[PDB]
Amino acid sequence: QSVTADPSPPTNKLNKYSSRITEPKSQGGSQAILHGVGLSDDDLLKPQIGISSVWYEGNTCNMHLLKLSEAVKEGVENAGMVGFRFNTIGVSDAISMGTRGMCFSLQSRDLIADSIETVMSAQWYDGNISIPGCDKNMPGTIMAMGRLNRPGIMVYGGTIKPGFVSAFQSYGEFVSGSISDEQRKTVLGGMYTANTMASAIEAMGMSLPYSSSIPAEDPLKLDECRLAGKYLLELLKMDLKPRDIITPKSLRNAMVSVMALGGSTNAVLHLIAIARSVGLELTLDDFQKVSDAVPFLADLKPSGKYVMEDIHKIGGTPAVLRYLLELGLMDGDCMTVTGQTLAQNLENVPSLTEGQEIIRPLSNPIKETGHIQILRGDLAPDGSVAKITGKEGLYFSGPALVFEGEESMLAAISADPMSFKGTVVVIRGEGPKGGPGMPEMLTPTSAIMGAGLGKECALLTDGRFSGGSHGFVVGHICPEAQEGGPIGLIKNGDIITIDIGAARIDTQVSPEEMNDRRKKWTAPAYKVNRGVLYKYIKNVQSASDGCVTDE
Amino acid sequence: QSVTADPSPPTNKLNKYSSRITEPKSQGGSQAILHGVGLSDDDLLKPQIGISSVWYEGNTCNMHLLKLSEAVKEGVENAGMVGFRFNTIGVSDAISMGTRGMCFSLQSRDLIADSIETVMSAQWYDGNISIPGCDKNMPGTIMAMGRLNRPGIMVYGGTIKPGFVSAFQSYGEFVSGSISDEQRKTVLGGMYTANTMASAIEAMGMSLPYSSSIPAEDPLKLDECRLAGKYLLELLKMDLKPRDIITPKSLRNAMVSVMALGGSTNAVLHLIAIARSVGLELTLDDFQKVSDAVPFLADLKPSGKYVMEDIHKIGGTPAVLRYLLELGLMDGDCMTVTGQTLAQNLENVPSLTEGQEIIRPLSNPIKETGHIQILRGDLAPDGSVAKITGKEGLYFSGPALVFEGEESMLAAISADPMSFKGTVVVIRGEGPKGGPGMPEMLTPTSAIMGAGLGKECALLTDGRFSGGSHGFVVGHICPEAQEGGPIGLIKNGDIITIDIGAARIDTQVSPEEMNDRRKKWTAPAYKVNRGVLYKYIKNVQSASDGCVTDE
Ligand code: FES
Ligand code: FES
């Protein structure tokens, strides 16, 4: 699809965009500012690289990205190019989890895409090198490269080596009586959104090999930063652009890595948004097809025992992708940011170390199909997402326990946990527009497990859940309750039946009484009327569409 | 008006917001990350200050803001508080002037407001210290403080001392024959948007005294940065919030400083957007009233001879505001970020140095009324803005010469400059939605002057012009041509009459034929369908509304 968003270049030149301001004499004012920032007359002939970091001091996953940004600029200069560093904003989910600040989390991804797109277009930079952290910005930088279609490389900031979930669990164990206060003070990584997206983006071919597996402050991470300029100079010579690297086949390669590694359900939203940014289509059914074709082979947290550094020891992400390619699960002809295809990159990487117990064989997988399950039915007619380990059974049925927010659900389970036994808990009003921002909720699952109701109740929402309750936990239910979807018409006592085999969330209420409720339903007032969250409400699409905001 | 946008605090505490994550035991995961970034147990009791810089390496007006940000964090720590630095994006108009990159300029102001609002809300910071550059971001930081209504101080980065307009003029003089190529290479400050907004925001009371007049890399600028934490600690003790400082009277104080200093017409858009962010109203008529009440007394560029450093020598901005206050033009009871009122701040500042020839007396002003004129009429029924020196006469009439963009106007004046003689030049399709982004255009005025047609033709647009042509130059014409306003119905040969006395832009075409054209008019297709500029088209209001996007 023809994506018209950003300026076009004014053929074998390496400064196709920066020559708009460095070569014409009518742009003498642009050259004077470039002379002011330190560019010589010979510098005006070189390509200009926009170096976009997501550095801020309020998160361990971003506090050291300015160091990486400085090494990237040095590598760009060593490649004979000009480096212009700029920095965008970012928020920490570990800080805001459990508060209204989570309403600002998911929208920051689209804010970051708009930020990099804005600077790259106004300053006429030729290429981009983005450095996101081990938080959840990553897809935002890829979305910006897709809009611009200028050569770019994503440098993952790296995952912090092990010493947040243990610190979040501390309050539950303290209240339950497992640990004391002192043990709680002492407590105060795996395949979550950060490691899922980094590994998927590398499998997508938009990050250099080993980028997703090298730890944060490993000396090799700085070495990767100083080499990004060399690879990007090659991409400018070939004019290998993001829309040449992000194809339906590379999109499937990223989906394969998510299913094989047990990636987060947030990858559904992010990969759909990334696919839309290059004019491609990616539906929930595409995820079910890849899920039913790729087995779970990865004994990593939260589902398993190991973390990302353990992957790094046994050969890193390229060793894992080499194994999947040898099993015929990935398309190796896809071009990458190395100037070569995926198979040419993987042909000369050390295989998984002998005797590794992280990556299971095809003979003995953790699960024969993928963890991601797309569920529809009467209550989620437009789709929903759930993480299924295969060990919880195929069915669950029970009366509905409906809550209009995460807060009222936590006050009920605290005051009467036994009234939750055998129920299908519905936390609605948490979607992209009703939240707003579609917040991620970790406390509902933890409170259910701390009450001893892990396998004795289900959990549905039009928002997002972080962890699993060893039962049935479903999110992304579309249409959301704010939009008048069936999830907004459920009443207490309604018998809800989840069928994993049929991939349906159904209600015993007849479709005629369901339509009777719909005719009487009025939309609740928006929780905000100003600010960035109100613009999100005015712009965001549904969860099944990746919550894109620019369509 | 009740502005509901950002989270509310969970009374005499100084950490009203950060205590949401530092004090509850259910937020143990938030405290672990805070321990990871270096906070001790005693640090969890202190207020948390969000330090938002607009640093990037591609502009002289922002390349040194990281140094200021580091000094601000040191001052915050010296005041016994915690400082969290984060950085947002920003674009340079001097780089993108004359290119399609200017379409991304004005929208970056609203992008910056969304950026700071996002970080402050998710991280639960108690206060803010923003450091914008001598580009045009400044109102964006104030808009974010108004949405949050948490104590905040704006630290102006400072204006660069004199060695861009001379570099932009170089091509015109080279083509005309005034200078050669070598003289042009050698060439490759005043009251423009940066100095206008900084001085207006200081007069508004949201910047410490002398902030707008101290040069960029003056040693006193670092001293101001290290003192912002002390003043903000006082604002937290008084709980003096932006909506206590930004009032209808302080809004008028900023408007008075714009009229007295001959500020840019962009201050109309920015001050309206700032007023909306605190739930207040500010119309174009309010600007005409202040304009007709405050005389132009300021011999500064581009209208005069001197620059901002000359103001700094004769006493800086506080000396100018003290003079206006003594003439009874400003309300001195307005609270400021110093914990005191404007009059208490100005009572003990050195007056204008004896013998200064920059600030004219009330007896001999440069202009008896303000430079800003609000024009309406048949062609701008919803308003328009123009800068009037008072020396160009009251009337202009001529046949219309219509262009659907800046590019087609420059190709015509280059090929046939004499066909412009005596015409009313109309460059339409450059508004907030038709541009898109409402770009600023400097080349139309320069090409008209270089052709010797400065006083022999007029200039109208639904976008923005930067400089004056010594004639009649009008922008912000509402409704814009994309919205089907009368500016989009003008045909070549239409007699347009500008009447400054009546404040009207009228056409000789009867209102019946005007409505005949309107019934046949169809909206042109949007120039983009994806990206941040398409979200701008979906969100932006009219120019008379300040081009706000969150309503
Ligand atoms: S805040 Fe970085 S992974 Fe959650
Ligand atoms: S780019 Fe800074 S004032 Fe224009």
Numbering used by the authors:
A (entry chain A), B (entry chain A): 3 to 12, 16 to 168, 177 to 201, 212 to 574
Wording from the paper:
Dihydroxy acid dehydratase (DHAD) is the third enzyme in the plant branched-chain amino acid biosynthetic pathway and the target for commercial herbicide development. We have previously reported the discovery of fungal natural product aspterric acid (AA) as a submicromolar inhibitor of DHAD through self-resistance gene directed genome mining. Here, we reveal the mechanism of AA inhibition on DHAD and the self-resistance mechanism of AstD, which is encoded by the self-resistance gene astD. Our structural and kinetic analysis of the mutant AthDHADs has validated the hypothesis that larger hydrophobic amino acids surrounding the active-site entrance enhance resistance to AA.
To determine if small-to-large amino acid mutations at these hydrophobic residues can decrease active site volume and increase resistance to AA, we generated multiple mutations at V496, V497, and I177 in AthDHAD followed by kinetic and structural characterizations. The substitution of I177L might result in smaller active cavity. TI177L and I177F mutants had an IC50 of 0.05 and 37.0 μM. To probe the acquired resistance mechanism of AthDHAD mutants, we determined the crystal of AthDHAD–I177F (2.45 Å), AthDHAD–V178W (1.77 Å), AthDHAD–V496W (1.59 Å), and AthDHAD–V497F (1.87 Å). In the crystal structures of I177F, V178W, V496W, and V497F, the occupancy of [2Fe–2S] cluster is 0.64, 0.72, 0.63, and 0.77, respectively. The overall structures of the AthDHAD mutants I177F, V178W, V496W, and V497F displayed high similarity with the wild-type AthDHAD, with the RMSD of 0.123 Å (888 core Cα atoms), 0.275 Å (994 core Cα atoms), 0.142 Å (1,034 core Cα atoms), and 0.283 Å (994 core Cα atoms), respectively. As a result, this mutant also affects the accession of AA to the active site. Both V178 and I177 are close to the active site. I177F make the cavity smaller, so that the cavity cannot accommodate the hydrophobic part of AA.
